[PDB]
A paper describes a structure:
The linear ubiquitin (Ub) chain assembly complex (LUBAC) generates Met1-linked “linear” Ub chains that regulate the activation of the nuclear factor κB (NFκB) transcription factor and other processes. (2006) identified the linear Ub chain assembly complex (LUBAC), which consists of the chain-assembling E3 ligase HOIP as well as HOIL-1 and SHARPIN (Walczak et al., 2012). Here, we show that OTULIN interacts directly with the N-terminal PUB domain of HOIP via a conserved PUB-interacting motif (PIM) in OTULIN.
As anticipated, residues 59–158 of HOIP form a PUB domain resembling that of PNGase, the only other PUB domain structurally characterized to date (Allen et al., 2006; Zhao et al., 2007). HOIP and PNGase superimpose with an rmsd of 7.2 Å for residues 59–158 of HOIP, and most secondary structure elements are conserved. In addition, the HOIP PUB domain contains two N-terminal helices and one C-terminal helix that contribute to the hydrophobic core of the PUB domain, revealing why shorter constructs were insoluble. Hydrophobic residues within the N-terminal extension are conserved among most HOIP orthologs, suggesting that the extended fold is conserved. In contrast, the residues forming a putative PIM pocket are highly conserved in HOIP. The HOIP PIM pocket is formed by hydrophobic residues located on helices α4 (equivalent to helix α2 in PNGase, hereafter named αA) and α5 (equivalent to helix α3 in PNGase, hereafter named αB) and on the β1 strand (compare Figures 2B and 1E).
Author numbering: 2 to 183
The structure:
Amino acid sequence: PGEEEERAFLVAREELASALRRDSGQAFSLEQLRPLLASSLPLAARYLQLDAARLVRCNAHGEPRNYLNTLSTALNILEKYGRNLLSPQRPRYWRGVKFNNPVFRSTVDAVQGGRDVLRLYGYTEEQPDGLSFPEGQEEPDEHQVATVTLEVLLLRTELSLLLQNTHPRQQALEQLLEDKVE
């Protein structure tokens, strides 16, 4: 991980976050994400907003095929919350998220630290049955939301590829989990 290796990564990371701001419903290809996937950087360096190591530590229980799927699905839902905040057609009820929502209960509530990601978006204040933005806040911090969404999108992409045995840096992640995803 040289200085020119850390430079290429920061740059693509800032650009991809900008891509989300322009089109929130936009889908990202594997080739589009690879500069952030195939980098030889420390885990704590790739995920600055997201605590990837803690997500693994608190959720890696049982078979890899199980908790990686539980994790990907949860991250997928969390990603959508972010995409919605950046969307031109944003729900009028965007200021809050309810934990007893059918999708949330079956996805995000299954993973430890799902609520922690929501606060990164801006859902910092405690509302009944969930989290919400402060009352005085007019709009989401689009740059903050774009940054978090990208990392959430990133981590899900890595976990998905692990299951597929197609990750460009597969060995490093299997050493993190200390188990092979068959």
